[PDB]
Design a protein around this ligand. Sequence first.
Ligand SMILES: O=C(NCCCCOc1ccc(Oc2c(-c3ccc(O)cc3)sc3cc(O)ccc23)cc1)[C@H]1CC[C@H](C(F)(F)F)CC1
Ligand SMILES: O=C(NCCCCOc1ccc(Oc2c(-c3ccc(O)cc3)sc3cc(O)ccc23)cc1)[C@H]1CC[C@H](C(F)(F)F)CC1
Lengths: 250, 233
Amino acid sequence: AIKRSKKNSLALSLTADQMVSALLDAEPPILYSEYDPTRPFSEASMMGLLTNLADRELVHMINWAKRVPGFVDLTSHDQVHLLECAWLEILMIGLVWRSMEHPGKLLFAPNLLLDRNQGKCVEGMVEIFDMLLATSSRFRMMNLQGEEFVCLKSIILLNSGVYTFLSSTLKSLEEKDHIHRVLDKITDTLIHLMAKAGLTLQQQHQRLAQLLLILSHIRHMSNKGMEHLYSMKCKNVVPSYDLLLEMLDA
Amino acid sequence: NSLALSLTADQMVSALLDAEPPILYSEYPFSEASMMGLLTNLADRELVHMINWAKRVPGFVDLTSHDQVHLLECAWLEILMIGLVWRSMEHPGKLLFAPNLLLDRNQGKCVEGMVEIFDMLLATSSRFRMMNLQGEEFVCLKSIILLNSGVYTFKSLEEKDHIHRVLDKITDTLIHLMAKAGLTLQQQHQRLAQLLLILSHIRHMSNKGMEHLYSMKCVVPSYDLLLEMLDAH
Ligand SMILES: O=C(NCCCCOc1ccc(Oc2c(-c3ccc(O)cc3)sc3cc(O)ccc23)cc1)[C@H]1CC[C@H](C(F)(F)F)CC1
Ligand SMILES: O=C(NCCCCOc1ccc(Oc2c(-c3ccc(O)cc3)sc3cc(O)ccc23)cc1)[C@H]1CC[C@H](C(F)(F)F)CC1
């Protein structure tokens, strides 16, 4: 079809209710882990299970991202770089959302619930597990709602890579301005949700701030996770997919 | 009880502005090991003043010395970087490490792996410029970084509760500044969101910087004084 100019992005013409509806409708399928439960539970086998789930979720992630209002207005290059930036943060926020109602455990999939002591089966994992558990506990304590969750997940996609567009082209400035406007609309939607829930104005701003501050922790977890995943690739417990990496690099 | 929680928004702004550290001039030929020596010497001197600034951030003194040290251990580089970004706002394409140390983006190429970090710092300064970030907001953001960046890695519930209450007061303060500047309610929450979203990028830059420094064989000389100032010695 026709690629609209940024001022004619569908994102900017959505009401708050329509933005929520769009984000809920984009939400990817629940996946079940496919595994043999009789296999001995080792570092290699655990990381293999998690890799297989990650690979399947990433397929659905791409289709989800394309359905996030504002995303497809970006160049294909900028789209890919948002995803390359955010993919682990997006996996992690999903995981902590899914795990909210299971204190002490991470619900990687409905049929794959792991506790922090299984995290110790993978060297370097338990520290990240504990951070994920703490984030899930914080979401539980804040009573994070599904409509808020989908807004936060879309914010991670749009925000985690915008600052590593380098402003070396005029197009980059247009892309940055567009992302800003979409992020403003998602903020309006988050406030709309909180106002409808009955929060006072002060409470609305405090809650928004607390939710956005958690995003900085999610970023931190992603960075530590990438460092951990690199170590796992050296041990040949996680694939390197180096040809995809050199693809993305060139 | 905590003085921080009894303060009004106007009083909080005053306290945060009053806590601001001095501007240091570089004191420390010109290879990569010398570039890292220059930047490390500057960081070492700034850290002495940072610890005194941290102790003056309302709410910080209420924590145990071990928690104060934990938060600083988590946030120190974020704080150095946000200061750098602020200082560089009026110097597009350059990083004002000090008034007598203005470095071009391409001077990052002198240290392997540094120019990518320079680029992220420059992008942050550009963002602050486009938003016309104000000093009053800057000090709120820096305080948020100190309190937020290690809170998730921590009676311990009483301390986390205290920190979240202080953070809520800073949010109120940022909103108050924006309201007094004439922003509509919609503009206020949008700007709050844009400011807090930049802190995700500052965290990223810190993480990347820590990895880079670990690569570059890089405790600052003044470490013992830092702990002494924190009463952690
Ligand atoms: O797809 C690629 N590789 C294969 C699939 C990913 C392989 O890595 C993973 C990733 C996660 C994983 O485990 C999970 C978490 C986790 C977090 C922190 C840790 O320290 C360890 C684990 S959290 C979590 C949440 C879930 O829902 C599911 C799983 C997990 C296990 C392995 C590349 C992507 C990037 C792309 C690029 F670069 F082009 F963009 C190139 C290709
Ligand atoms: O000693 C400690 N760590 C090891 C110290 C090693 C020295 O570190 C640096 C840090 C920065 C640096 O260069 C600067 C920037 C930069 C950022 C990213 C890069 O990749 C490269 C450069 S940005 C920037 C901005 C500036 O204003 C000035 C300099 C710089 C050069 C060296 C802790 C201290 C605190 C203590 C605590 F917390 F308890 F108190 C815990 C222990």
